[PDB]
Structure formats: C-alpha cells, structure tokens
Amino acid sequence: PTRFSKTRKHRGHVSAGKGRVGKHRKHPGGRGMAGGQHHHRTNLDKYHPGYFGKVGMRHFHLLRNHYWRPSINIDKLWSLVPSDVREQYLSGQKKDTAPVIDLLSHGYAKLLGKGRLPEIPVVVRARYVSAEAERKVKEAGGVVELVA
Amino acid sequence: AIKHNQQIPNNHFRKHWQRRVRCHFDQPGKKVTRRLARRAKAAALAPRPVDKLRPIVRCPTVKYNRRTRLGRGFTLEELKAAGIPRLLAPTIGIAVDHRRKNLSEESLAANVQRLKDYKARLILFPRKSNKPKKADTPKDQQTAETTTSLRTSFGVEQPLAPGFTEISKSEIPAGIEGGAYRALRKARSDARLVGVREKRAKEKAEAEA
RNA sequence: CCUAGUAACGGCGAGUGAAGCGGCAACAGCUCAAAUUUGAAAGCUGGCUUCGGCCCGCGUUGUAAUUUGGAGAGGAUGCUUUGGGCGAGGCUCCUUCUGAGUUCCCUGGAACGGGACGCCACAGAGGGUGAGAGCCCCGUAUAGUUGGAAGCCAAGCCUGUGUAAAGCUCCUUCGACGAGUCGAGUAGUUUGGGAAUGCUGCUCAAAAUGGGAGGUAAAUUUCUUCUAAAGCUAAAUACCGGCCAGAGACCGAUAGCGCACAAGUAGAGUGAUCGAAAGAUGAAAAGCACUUUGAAAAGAGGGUUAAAUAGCACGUGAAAUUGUUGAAAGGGAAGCGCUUGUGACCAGACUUGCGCCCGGCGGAUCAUCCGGUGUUCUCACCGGUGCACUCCGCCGGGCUCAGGCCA
RNA sequence: CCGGGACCGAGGACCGCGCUCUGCAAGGAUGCUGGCGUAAUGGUCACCAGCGACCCGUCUUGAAACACGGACCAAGGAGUCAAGGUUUUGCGCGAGUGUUUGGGUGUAAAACCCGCACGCGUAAUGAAAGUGAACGUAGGUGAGAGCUUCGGCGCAUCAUCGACCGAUCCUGAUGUAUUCGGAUGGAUUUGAGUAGGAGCGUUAAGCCUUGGACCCGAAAGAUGGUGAACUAUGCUUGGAUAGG
RNA sequence: AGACUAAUCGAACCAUCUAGUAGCUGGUUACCGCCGAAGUUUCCCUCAGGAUAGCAGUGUCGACCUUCAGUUUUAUGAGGU
RNA sequence: UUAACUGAACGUGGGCAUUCGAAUGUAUCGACACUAGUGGGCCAUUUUUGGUAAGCAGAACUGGCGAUGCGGGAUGAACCG
RNA sequence: GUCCCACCCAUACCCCGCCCUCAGGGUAGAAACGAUGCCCUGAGGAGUAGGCGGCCGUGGAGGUCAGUGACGAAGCCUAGGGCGUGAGCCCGGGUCGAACGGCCUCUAGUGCAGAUCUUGGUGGUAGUAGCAAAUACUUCAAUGAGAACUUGAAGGACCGAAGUGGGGAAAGGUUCCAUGUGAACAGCGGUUGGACAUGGGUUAGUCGAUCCUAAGCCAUAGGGAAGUUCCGUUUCAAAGGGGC
RNA sequence: GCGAUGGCCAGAAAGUGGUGUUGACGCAAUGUGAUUUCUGCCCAGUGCUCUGAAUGUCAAAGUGAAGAAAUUCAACCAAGC
RNA sequence: AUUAACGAGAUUCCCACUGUCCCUAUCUACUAUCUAGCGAAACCACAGCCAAGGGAACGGGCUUGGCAAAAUCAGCGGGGAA
RNA sequence: GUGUGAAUACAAACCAUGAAAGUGUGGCCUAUCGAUCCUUUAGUCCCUCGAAAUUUGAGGCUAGAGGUGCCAGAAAAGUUAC
C-alpha cells in the first residue's frame, strides 16, 4: 500500500529528504563488497571478524546421508508413548509390564541423557547411546539394546 | 558498500535474469486439463483399472533405510515362483523389472504373496464370447464390485514398523556382558587396528619358523 | 518441490556454484553385426499383363526366416495356445425451431423518464430502436426435436482349424558379443571437478574373466557394480511466431503499439535506413427555396430545426493574446503589507412569542365507574355512561415577561 | 484618609472562606434612560493618503548582486517493483508450526476439503576421527514490584562466587588379542553452550544489497552492413586551346 | 598539407550491444503541529569521496526507586606558566 | 601465609538512629533497540605562533553567524539591547 | 568635560481574553456516555539539513445512503455570498446537454514555476529591417469592375556571332498546343503564366538501340573454407562441326 | 639486396597472387638535390655484417644410474647470447 | 663555399609619379529619406535619470541627498560588466 | 578503548649466582620495525585421502623465517603546438 508511506510526505520539499550537500549520487563507495580490505576495513573488523583467510581441510564429494543421526534427550523419552497409556504407567496401575520403545521408528538414532527419569523400568532400542544415558536408564531398572 | 551491522549479502542477480523469468499464472488452468485427460483415459479402459501393480521396496540409503515404498516392477524370479508366464504378465497389468534381483528372502516372500492374492482377485474375459477356453472366467462369477485406483487398494499397508510394544516384566533380557557403551568403543577400535594386528602376527610366525 | 546458496572453484578478492537420496506429474517397451537353409535365394525394384502369371534385372564380396545377454543354441517330457464375417447400441460435426404489456395519465421534438395496474423467468448476460426497455427486435437458459456426411468405440452372435507356428518345466555339455576404437603423453578451450570433469589436434597404440567406473598422484593384494566404441520409439515440458476464441480492480486521442483515419502511407537520403500529423454536425440533411445590393467572393431580409448560442472553418469552447463599450489612475517604473476616508455594490437580524383576566363563537367530552385487549404487573389503549362555574380550537379587548442596532 | 482619568466584564442554579451579620463591595456586571428599526452598524472592490517593503529557484562561510536558469500560457513530468536480510507494530497456533509441488470437489483462474514427505525450531563443540549437558527442593550472596498468618516468600532484571558439556595442557586405576583401553584427580586457558524450552506463518513501517534502480547527461569500446554522383591515383576510349 | 575518402577525417556513414559507467553539474509536485544538528576523532593510491565514533529523531521498558549536579563550602594531594 | 589459631579474604551472632551525620536545586532517574543528515566552515574579547604588514596563514577556553526575525549603530551575517 | 530633573518607544517585563501542545485529577449498586466524550487545574510556543504525528484533494474496487438527474447530471465564466488558521468545502447568477455524488474499508502510472525540461499555441520588438548587381523606358487605341509590368501600331534602346541567336549529349517527365477560370502560387498588381480546370499531341528496311571487341565482370574443369562464400577464365577436362 | 629452388610485397588457407608479355644498360629499398670547386679525423657507444677451430650459457625429444612405481640425479646438447 | 638565368618569396637605397600627408574642398550614379503595396529575425526575471555610502571589496532597485510634466522623428556608438 | 610496535605485575616449570636475604622473562628509562594468500623449517607420533588393507606421496593442527620504507601492506615509461 503506497497511500501511506514517507514518499507521500516529501512532496513539496525539494531534495526529497536526501540532503542538500550530499545529493544521493549513484554509487559513491563502489558496488557490493568492494573495498573490503581498503576503505571498509573498519566495518569488516568491528563486525564479522573472521571474514578473510583460509582454515581447515577440504572434503571432495560430501554426501550428507552418511552423517544422519538425529538425537533425543532422556527427559523427553516418556513423551514417546501415547497419553492414555502414559498416564496408566505414571499413575501406577500396571506393576507387571514394561514398554519397549523403538527410537528408530519415531525418527531418532542416538539417545543422549540430560534430565532425570522416574523409577519405572523401560526398554530402549537405539543405534547409538551415551555413557551418562546408559547409567540412568540402567539404575531405573531397564536395559538398552543395539539394533542397527 | 556496507553501512551497519547486516548479514553479508549474496544475490545471484548479475546476468540478464529478466529475460528468463517464469511465472505460473496458469496453475488452475493446467489442473483442469489434467483431469479431462484422466477421464478420457478412464473411459478408454472401460472395465480395467487405470494404474499397474507395483512391488514393495526398501529405500536404498542408510538414512531413509527404515521406510518402504512402491517399486517399478517385479523381478523375473518373483514371476516364476508365483507361476506366471513371462510374456503374459505385462498384458494383464502386472509390470516387470528387467534389472532388479533378489538378495534376501523376505522381499522375495513378501512379493510372491502379493502376486498370489492378486491372481485370486482377477477376472479374465475371453478373447471371443462364443468360444470360451479353460483359463477364462466361467461367465457366472463375472459380476462383482470392481476397483479402479489400484494405488489405494494395493498401497503399502504400513511404511514404518510399529513404534512400541509391551512385554511382561521378568522377561526383559540382559544387555551385553560389559555395558552397551563399552561395546561400541571396542567394536570401533578393532576395525581401526585390523591391518596392523594381522601383520604383526604373521611376521612372528614366519620369522620364528 | 526439496537437497542448496550446501560440497567445491576464486589476484581464496569482487564473485561464481552442481550431483545422489526423498514426494509428485506421466509411464512402454524393443532391432541389427558376430552361426552353413546347403535336401534345393526360400528374397526384391521395373516393364507387360487380364489378376493367373511372364520377362529382363539386383544379388552368393550374402537378399528372407532363425538369435540380441532378460539370454540363447542342442537334447529329452507332457500339457496348453493361434484364423475370418457380421454387428445392436454409444461418442464426435454442421443445419432446422423455442415465454411474457408496446394497457391508462403527466413532462418532452421523440418515453427507454415519473405515477397506476399486470405477466414470464433452468431465460433479470449483452446490443439496437429519436433519453436508464426482463415482456418492441436480435440474442440469452434447459433437453429434446428437422435433415445430412464421414469416422471411431463397442454388448453379443455366425463360421473354419494343423502337424504350420507359439508358450511352460528339466539337463551332460556348448554359448559366437562392435579397433587407428579404449587407454597413455602433450597443447588449447570449458566446467564447481581441485597431481587435470567433457571436447578437439598431434605421437604411441592394447587384452580375454577381459574392460570401464568406485571424486587425491604411485606400487602390491582383495572387493562392489555394469558390459562402450551400431540403431528406433508416444505422454508429463517450452512457446502468443501462424489460425481462431474467451476474459481484466489495464489506457482513454500529447494516453494506449510507430499506426482508433486511403500508416509502414505522405516525406528525407545516392544508399544501408529514418519516418510523422490527422477521431465527434443533427434523431433525421430537413446541407438554407425566393426577393434584394454587389463585377464576384459575399452581405441583409425570409426560411428548416426542440436549438443555427449546432451552418460542412460544424458537441461542449478555458488561459496566453486582440477589438468595441462602461469605470478609474498616471511630475524618471509598476506591483505589495498595517490603518482610516470617498464612491459603487451586498449578505444578515428585526416585521413577534409565551402566560394571565374578561366577552363571543363552534365542537365532542372533561374527572369517575363498567367490559375487552396489550404491557415495563402498574402504568396505558379501545367501547359505553358521563351532558355545561369541566375540556378543547378560534376571534375581540386589557395586562406582566422576553425579544434587533448605536449610544 | 480623600479626589481625577484610561482599558477590561472571562464564568452561568445553591454548595466555600468571611464581615460592619433583618444584610454585604464575600468563589468574574448589574440598574435606569434616549434615538433608529434601515444601507443606519457591518462586509467586498476600486482609488487617493501616513509609515513600511531590493527577484524568484540554487551551489556557497557569505546572493538583490557586475554569479548561473527563467518572454508568456495549456497539457505531460521524477524514490517504483521483485528476490534475499534485519529491527519494530497487529494477528493465529504454541514444543511445535507451515493446506495450494500435488490430489478431491466446484455456482469454475473464486470458495471448501486431504495427506506421505520436506523446511525452520527443539543441542553444542572441534580442522577432524569423535564425544555430547542435575551433588543441592535446578546452588550461595546483595538488591528488587507484589503478596503476607507480619515472621517471611520473593517474578522480570542487574552485580558476583560456584556447578555441568565440547576443545587444549597435565595426571595414568582395575584390566588385557602385551600393546590396546583411558577410570580418577587437576589447570592466571577456550565456545555463537546447559542451568524448569519460544518458535513458526502472516500483515504494516524504517533501513541495506543486486538489479535500467529518483529523473536527464559524456570524450570512448565491440558486432554486422552501405558508399569513389564531390575529391585522390591509375587504366580503356574520345574532345578542345586567337594574334605577335 | 595529417591532406582527400558525398557541406563529416589525427580514423567515414547506418543499425544493434545500449536506458553503456560517472566519487561530477541540473531538477525533484498539498497544508498544519511537536522535536531539532554537523563541518570534529581514527583508518583508506584518502584530499570534490567512503567506513568508524560523536551530535539528532522515534519506539519503549524498570521504579516513580528518591537518586543525581558544566555549582559552592570544609579536609587533603599533584604542577613549573 | 606465619615458629604458632599468628594473619588474609568470605562469613554466623550482637550492639550503636530520639537526631542517617556541610549548603542549594531536583521545570526532568537508569537501561535498551532501529535509523536520518553532517564529516569545505567563518567572526569576536583574552592568551598566542610565521610574516614589514594585510579584509593574510595557523592554534587554546568561551560566546556568536551559519540555521534568526525584532529595537539601536543613517546604510551593513558576526557589534549593543 | 562633569553633574542633576522630566519625557519618547521593541515581537523584552507585568495583568486580562482567545488557540494549540504537554502534564496532573474527577465522572456506574449507572436519572448513562460520538468513555476516542465531558468537566477542573498548571506551565510552555523562534528555526535550515533532518525525524515523527494529524488532516485535505485525484483515477479505480467492495459495502451502504431504498442518494441526485432531460421540470436539466458533468464541465466552463462570475471586483456575488457563507465556513475553516490552512491545503480546501458549500451556495447564488449565466452558458450547456447525459450522466454523477456523500460515508467506512481496499488499491495506485495520485497533487508542479523552474530542470539552456517535452509537444502545441501566442506576444513586445514592428507596419520596423528591408524588397538598391546585369544601362530604360514613352504616346495612342482595344478588352475589362480594376492596367507601369495584357495585346496592336508608332518611337527610343540592349545582346553585337568565344550572343541574351539556331540545335544537341547527361538530367527533367507532359512542363508542348487549344479553350476557359473563383480562391491559392508568380516576396507589388495581374484580364497574363512553366500555376488551376477540360480536351489534343510523339508514325522509320535507309536516324539510333539491336551486331563486334577494349580496360573490366561472371558461369564451367578443379582446389580451399565450420560456413555466408574466396581463388580460378585455359588451366593436371573423354569439352566440338561439316557434308549427303 | 638479388642469378629465379631467388629478392621485395599481398592472403584465414589454397593445384592463390603483384613486380613479370620481366633477367643486372634489370627489378626493388634509401639519402642528397642544376653547373663549377671540394667532400678532412674517429669503429670506443647504438646498429648492420663475417668464420667456427673455442665451451662459457642452454628447451622439447633422446641416453645412463637409483627406486616396487610415480619421480629424482647425471652427462650429452641446435639456433641465439 | 661561390653562382649567370628565373621568382604574385623576405629585406635596404635612388630617379620619375602622385590627396599617403600639411588640410581639406567639390561633382556624378545607387541607397539611406517620404509615400502606395508586401512585410521578417536575433533578443527579453521586472524594467530602465544621477552623486556618495555600505555590501560578494565597481548598483537601475537599498540608505542619505540632487531632482522630477503628455505623445513623438533622423543620427550616434558611453552604458546596459550588451 | 580495533590491529602492529613497545612496556608492566603475577602463575606453573627448569636453571644461574651468592654464606644468606634476595636478584634475573635481553641492553638503566624514553626510538631501533611488518597483515590475508603462497613457500619453508621445528613439534606430537596426532587426524584424513570417503569400497577394505600395507608402504611412498599429498592434505591438516600449534610456533618461527622469506615483505610490502607510498611503512593498516595495487604488479607499471613518455609526448601532444593535431
């Protein structure tokens, strides 16, 4: 909508708000990132430190699929079972059954461990697992298998 | 000419891009044309479905390894096991994949089940009405409700194996002897040192003897 | 569409920049060289023929059948499969036909305008007729209906039939597979391709479990996946150049294409080429008969029209600039701001209102009660009774209050 | 304590502070009277009169300038659009969010419905192989709006001392494919981290980059074509120039 | 003679690339209200120009925290005009 | 760290307000976000450098013109109010 | 030169009225309110470059006024009125002939004095500069509305055979002749015209072109070049013509 | 400078061209400028030209050695300098 | 270095000649001039009397003074930094 | 309140000197010098060459050197009197 924009309030004032001494010429300073090392160095060194230079080794023909392994913490593990079944377990009316959660189906590969866990035995099937995660799931009463 | 804190721009507008701009102002119009073509195709193939049977297939990378999907055609070994002539198969709507082959036995077993229950649901009008043959339909179980999609009636039942199950306590197994984190570390280090360890062993035996 | 502004290239500066996987649209598979039919060139252009054939020619330095890696050839074994002719009925194209007022009054030159009364509607999209017309006219909506030509799809019927050809299951053994090509060195160009991604020129020039590829140069030993140097084939995709059709929160004659008009025309240059300006009388020309002045162009009367303040220099007709009439000022500029004065011209406001007393006129009907209805449930409406010191309207006289401008 | 003059009259029932207290000069003007009821008061325009008054736009420390543009009138005439960022305002959902590449349907370029994948966010750090976030009621201290049984509990945020994850430098337990593994404990080191999630889509404004980029403006450079009717040189074929 | 090559020659004329680039001249269209500057520091083949800090506007949030001050007094230090 | 519970930092508990320990003001407290113009200056009292001097060139604290009309110096951006 | 009385006026100071901006308060058992309203109190107002807020106009789109109009819509003229501080809005009088407004949202090719701006039109200068090379005209009569530049007769002159004579090549294209004629052209006039209108006019065995070659151009045999095409004209060619 | 297997010059190339229907009393490239009288010294510098005994320098290809290979190390080495 | 002849080549002197000059005067033709007919252009912020002052340091406009009378014709080259 | 040059006070090691307390992180103090890319050396015994191994080769991480004097750092000869 152009009916309310600052260009409609400039009609009648010569120079259209761009100044009388500096007249808004075409390209004073150069096009693009010109002068990066010469007259725009102050900007490129107060901000963006690290722009120039080379670092690290290179890698020909990277295939991103080789590096697919999304993770999941340990406090969100209980959010993988439906709500109605979940409340039955946490409220304490089963006492004799344990859920076998399969991370791979729900789209996870590694089970990291960050939070706490309630003292109910479970069974986890993962591709990768961390040292801290293993300890917590084991002291709760369950075990973790490797499935590939 | 940067003036403030911004993100360093990179806009690939430096050729004569204005000469190659594509606008899709005919999105609804095309849709209408496609639907007209489908109805014409459906009317030409009067009693037959529109699509063609595909087999079940597992995705080929380590990512996406879990899901399954439809393939292109059935392999020659699959057709032979179900007992279907090599040349008759394409005519009756079953496809064929010149260049796929079966390594395991679950995909083989899955696909032969697919063919077998399809042949049970297949009618087959004779080539001439006045002279029926032995492999044709006997003209009395010939009137029934038919399907036309063949993608919904024969799609993948479940791409991903059930998320979770339940088992009685005191039936949960025990892990690997020492941990399940030490198991991974050990299995990694072994493959790292396969070359050196074997070489050292071989030299000692030959040198001693 | 996403991968992705990612891996990578780059005076590693400015900048440049793909591919695999994943979801969908559309789906369709195949033929030649390398084999001896060898118990019978079984093949083909041309000419003549009466339609059955014949003649010359091509060709054994290889024309048909058979085979193309999915295999296949050669063997057994038992099963199964294969020709013609009709054809209801349906789908495309053009062409015949389709409901309702011009009723009554007013303004107007002319109703398609205003008022009163009606009718049709699977049709109130659009245009014309003397001004905004659903019913004056063309068309518009729905499924049939008149007639005709050429094609397609197709329910189901009637007919032959073998040692000709085809398909499946097993096997000792065989199993032919594209050369100045692949590859290497060197030079140039190009790519994101980095001890060199593709292409091309020059030099060297292969092999049979061989060869290529496996994104960092080399040697040794394994592994994975395909089978090049011969060929054909619809659909999803691009485009307004050609032929047609439907539309727009687009422009409205200095705009919109250079062109709404006898526009790529008139015109300029030796030439390649450059390239405009220009829409609108009135409903209907009814485009001014006749008299008179003038050599004529034309003028004045007189006519047509609702209007000539529409007269082919024609709808409406602004400003710059000019003429006539009326008013005013002017001793080397004019215009302008604050404040009076003279002259000309002019908008407002006031011209009564309310109340009380007395007299006259006319009317239905004040308080109260009874019945019915509504509603905010205690306040009202309608019908009857109520009949003159009650109520209402008007006129005449008197009185209080207020109301315009300057002081 | 008594005179003389000028300018002004805002507000619109009582409510107040007071005094000389049947009232008042106390929280803002009333009373009596005259002429005229129209050009009289008032307004617009033209002219004379007293005082004042250099031509606009622009560059510039400085313009009325002997600085530049401008004879007059009518119409045309200049910060826009797209992709990608960023902060702020309004809206929907919320650990999730986003239908429209596509399909179904339709009174048909409208409106309505559908879901597999996918993008951003939910986890960081190293060049990399890799590893990967709780001792405490998710800590202690000083302030903090608010609540409170009055003792205290203390959101957001500010300052400070600690704890945990990755990288770097030391330390080197039980074990053992005897050369593999790296527990435990430290360090004037380091991170775009954790420590009871805040994001995704869309609307509007300012700003930035590439684009013809607010509008008009070069001396040059390249690709492809047309000219010896003037003039330069030459070839073939012709013509012309008294009398001493 | 840098002379002539269609009034054009120290490199002809015509169309396209082409709206070629400009740190340089010129212009940039209605009204009212509130706030209201700089020609200075550092860097650049920088000196008719840019980035950076400063001066300015708008939008807010935390309290109404009771803190602050281009100033004076009292006590106590430094200076070489 | 010291010969040492001798110190150093951070602390628990208690005591000292009856008056929180000079004047004046508080017509303006703290923090954050995004961004415009500017980056040629000139004049004056006092101090002062080069120059014979200049309506010349170059500096320090402050006040002005630029960006500002009004009354006075007859006239005049910088003077007096 | 020093001292002492009175007096004169700034947009400065004091008091009062009015406008706006900013700040602080009151207003529901609602007899209540464009609550974005009303009422009470105090202070302030200069400004280029620049920032923000509020309002007014133009061309189109959705909704609504059951809006105006041939008994006169839009447009234009008007020292005729009213409103607003202002951009602007509303009415009276004249001309004209078919469509047009108010309110809330959406949308943009949206507001002009300048740019030696673009196109079109018109002025002062101004009835001014000027219409002066090539020796030159005069009398009578006729036609005609009108005669210096039409015709006849008579005078006076010039070109003075390297002519202002008589014919041609290039170029021009009906300009040649007759009859008639309003306006336009013949830089004055015009009955006259190379102008305007209507008709007519160019005859070849003997004059040319057609035939032959010159300087030169282009096919064929061949060889280059990605190609449009460049070379090649007797060349490394099986190239013909005469009789019955 | 040149005896045609050649000198000077055109062309992208060619079974292509100009000088050339030419052959040193000729073709091609330069300087001075009638006649008369003359035209001195300098080969260090910049150019042009001449002979390869001298080995100083030296590319691709070729030769020898090490290595399992990529590769590295050595001689030999045309014209020009 | 000289050099006969030649030159619309540059330079100095002499004889004859003359309005080049002392020093100006007169005559003829065609315009300019007036009339009848026809009839443009450059240029132009507004315009057009001076002296001094200050000012962007040389004003037509400002301040202080001088002054100041309609409408016009032929010449002129100070100024309008034409 | 960026970089370069230079400087100050500690911490953890290993040392010199002195009987000892102590002193010493270049010259008694104020100047004496240098980015990205590339090459080269030192260090661990470290990571990678992405089908799997072993040795060559190459690429990485940390610290120095090869230099920009226009010294916050382009690679660069004249004339125009056409």
PDB file of C-alpha atoms in Angstrom, chain A residues 9-103:
ATOM      1  CA  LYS A   9       5.004  13.343   2.800  1.00  0.00           C
ATOM      2  CA  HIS A  10       8.077  14.509   0.875  1.00  0.00           C
ATOM      3  CA  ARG A  11       6.087  16.076  -1.975  1.00  0.00           C
ATOM      4  CA  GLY A  12       6.683  19.818  -1.798  1.00  0.00           C
ATOM      5  CA  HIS A  13      10.115  19.689  -0.145  1.00  0.00           C
ATOM      6  CA  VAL A  14      12.975  19.919  -2.645  1.00  0.00           C
ATOM      7  CA  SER A  15      15.672  17.184  -2.351  1.00  0.00           C
ATOM      8  CA  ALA A  16      13.114  14.591  -1.115  1.00  0.00           C
ATOM      9  CA  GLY A  17      14.723  14.231   2.286  1.00  0.00           C
ATOM     10  CA  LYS A  18      18.152  13.215   0.972  1.00  0.00           C
ATOM     11  CA  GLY A  19      20.115  16.329   1.880  1.00  0.00           C
ATOM     12  CA  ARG A  20      21.344  19.415   0.058  1.00  0.00           C
ATOM     13  CA  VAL A  21      25.117  18.999   0.376  1.00  0.00           C
ATOM     14  CA  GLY A  22      25.339  15.254  -0.235  1.00  0.00           C
ATOM     15  CA  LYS A  23      22.950  14.769  -3.081  1.00  0.00           C
ATOM     16  CA  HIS A  24      22.361  10.985  -3.221  1.00  0.00           C
ATOM     17  CA  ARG A  25      24.513  10.253  -6.244  1.00  0.00           C
ATOM     18  CA  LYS A  26      24.630   6.889  -7.981  1.00  0.00           C
ATOM     19  CA  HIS A  27      27.284   4.664  -6.357  1.00  0.00           C
ATOM     20  CA  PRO A  28      29.661   6.517  -4.026  1.00  0.00           C
ATOM     21  CA  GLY A  29      31.813   3.836  -2.412  1.00  0.00           C
ATOM     22  CA  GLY A  30      31.620   1.068  -5.008  1.00  0.00           C
ATOM     23  CA  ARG A  31      29.212  -1.752  -5.771  1.00  0.00           C
ATOM     24  CA  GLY A  32      28.815  -4.713  -3.450  1.00  0.00           C
ATOM     25  CA  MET A  33      31.600  -5.672  -1.046  1.00  0.00           C
ATOM     26  CA  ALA A  34      34.256  -3.541  -2.723  1.00  0.00           C
ATOM     27  CA  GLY A  35      36.978  -2.055  -0.578  1.00  0.00           C
ATOM     28  CA  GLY A  36      36.778  -4.831   1.990  1.00  0.00           C
ATOM     29  CA  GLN A  37      40.470  -4.549   2.835  1.00  0.00           C
ATOM     30  CA  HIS A  38      40.987  -0.874   1.959  1.00  0.00           C
ATOM     31  CA  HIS A  39      38.246   1.571   2.996  1.00  0.00           C
ATOM     32  CA  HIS A  40      35.602  -0.716   4.522  1.00  0.00           C
ATOM     33  CA  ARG A  41      38.029  -2.432   6.894  1.00  0.00           C
ATOM     34  CA  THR A  42      36.675  -0.618   9.953  1.00  0.00           C
ATOM     35  CA  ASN A  43      33.250  -2.158   9.353  1.00  0.00           C
ATOM     36  CA  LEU A  44      34.575  -5.622   8.490  1.00  0.00           C
ATOM     37  CA  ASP A  45      36.629  -5.623  11.708  1.00  0.00           C
ATOM     38  CA  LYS A  46      34.095  -4.257  14.177  1.00  0.00           C
ATOM     39  CA  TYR A  47      31.641  -6.799  12.760  1.00  0.00           C
ATOM     40  CA  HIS A  48      32.206 -10.135  11.015  1.00  0.00           C
ATOM     41  CA  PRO A  49      35.655 -10.934  12.492  1.00  0.00           C
ATOM     42  CA  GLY A  50      36.904 -13.910  10.523  1.00  0.00           C
ATOM     43  CA  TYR A  51      35.875 -12.917   7.016  1.00  0.00           C
ATOM     44  CA  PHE A  52      39.308 -13.226   5.382  1.00  0.00           C
ATOM     45  CA  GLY A  53      41.666 -16.186   5.445  1.00  0.00           C
ATOM     46  CA  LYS A  54      41.673 -19.945   4.982  1.00  0.00           C
ATOM     47  CA  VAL A  55      41.266 -22.664   7.613  1.00  0.00           C
ATOM     48  CA  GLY A  56      40.733 -26.409   7.781  1.00  0.00           C
ATOM     49  CA  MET A  57      40.973 -29.282   5.340  1.00  0.00           C
ATOM     50  CA  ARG A  58      38.712 -29.766   2.336  1.00  0.00           C
ATOM     51  CA  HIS A  59      36.441 -32.690   1.512  1.00  0.00           C
ATOM     52  CA  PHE A  60      35.624 -33.772  -2.043  1.00  0.00           C
ATOM     53  CA  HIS A  61      32.104 -35.011  -2.850  1.00  0.00           C
ATOM     54  CA  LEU A  62      30.412 -34.827   0.537  1.00  0.00           C
ATOM     55  CA  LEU A  63      27.292 -36.976   0.870  1.00  0.00           C
ATOM     56  CA  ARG A  64      25.142 -35.675   3.719  1.00  0.00           C
ATOM     57  CA  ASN A  65      23.359 -39.012   4.167  1.00  0.00           C
ATOM     58  CA  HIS A  66      26.441 -40.629   5.714  1.00  0.00           C
ATOM     59  CA  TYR A  67      26.128 -38.207   8.640  1.00  0.00           C
ATOM     60  CA  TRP A  68      22.441 -38.611   9.525  1.00  0.00           C
ATOM     61  CA  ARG A  69      21.873 -39.326  13.200  1.00  0.00           C
ATOM     62  CA  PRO A  70      19.426 -37.026  14.999  1.00  0.00           C
ATOM     63  CA  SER A  71      19.398 -37.212  18.769  1.00  0.00           C
ATOM     64  CA  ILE A  72      16.931 -37.102  21.642  1.00  0.00           C
ATOM     65  CA  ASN A  73      17.447 -36.356  25.312  1.00  0.00           C
ATOM     66  CA  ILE A  74      16.378 -38.658  28.151  1.00  0.00           C
ATOM     67  CA  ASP A  75      13.747 -36.461  29.830  1.00  0.00           C
ATOM     68  CA  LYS A  76      11.660 -36.357  26.637  1.00  0.00           C
ATOM     69  CA  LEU A  77      11.785 -40.152  26.348  1.00  0.00           C
ATOM     70  CA  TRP A  78       8.465 -40.633  28.141  1.00  0.00           C
ATOM     71  CA  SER A  79       6.767 -38.355  25.598  1.00  0.00           C
ATOM     72  CA  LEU A  80       7.142 -41.157  23.027  1.00  0.00           C
ATOM     73  CA  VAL A  81       4.270 -43.259  24.424  1.00  0.00           C
ATOM     74  CA  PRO A  82       0.634 -42.167  23.836  1.00  0.00           C
ATOM     75  CA  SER A  83      -1.038 -40.071  26.510  1.00  0.00           C
ATOM     76  CA  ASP A  84      -3.597 -42.597  27.756  1.00  0.00           C
ATOM     77  CA  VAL A  85      -1.046 -45.409  28.102  1.00  0.00           C
ATOM     78  CA  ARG A  86       1.428 -42.914  29.580  1.00  0.00           C
ATOM     79  CA  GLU A  87      -0.846 -41.870  32.448  1.00  0.00           C
ATOM     80  CA  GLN A  88      -1.535 -45.517  33.337  1.00  0.00           C
ATOM     81  CA  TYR A  89       2.190 -46.144  33.788  1.00  0.00           C
ATOM     82  CA  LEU A  90       2.978 -42.976  35.734  1.00  0.00           C
ATOM     83  CA  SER A  91      -0.078 -43.341  37.971  1.00  0.00           C
ATOM     84  CA  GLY A  92       0.916 -46.892  38.890  1.00  0.00           C
ATOM     85  CA  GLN A  93      -1.755 -49.435  37.919  1.00  0.00           C
ATOM     86  CA  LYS A  94       0.179 -51.945  35.780  1.00  0.00           C
ATOM     87  CA  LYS A  95       3.063 -53.068  38.027  1.00  0.00           C
ATOM     88  CA  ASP A  96       3.880 -56.002  35.746  1.00  0.00           C
ATOM     89  CA  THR A  97       4.554 -54.770  32.185  1.00  0.00           C
ATOM     90  CA  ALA A  98       7.333 -52.722  30.592  1.00  0.00           C
ATOM     91  CA  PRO A  99       7.189 -50.686  27.360  1.00  0.00           C
ATOM     92  CA  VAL A 100       9.666 -51.416  24.574  1.00  0.00           C
ATOM     93  CA  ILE A 101      10.320 -48.074  22.870  1.00  0.00           C
ATOM     94  CA  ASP A 102      11.937 -48.131  19.414  1.00  0.00           C
ATOM     95  CA  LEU A 103      13.662 -44.810  18.741  1.00  0.00           C
TER      96      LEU A 103
END
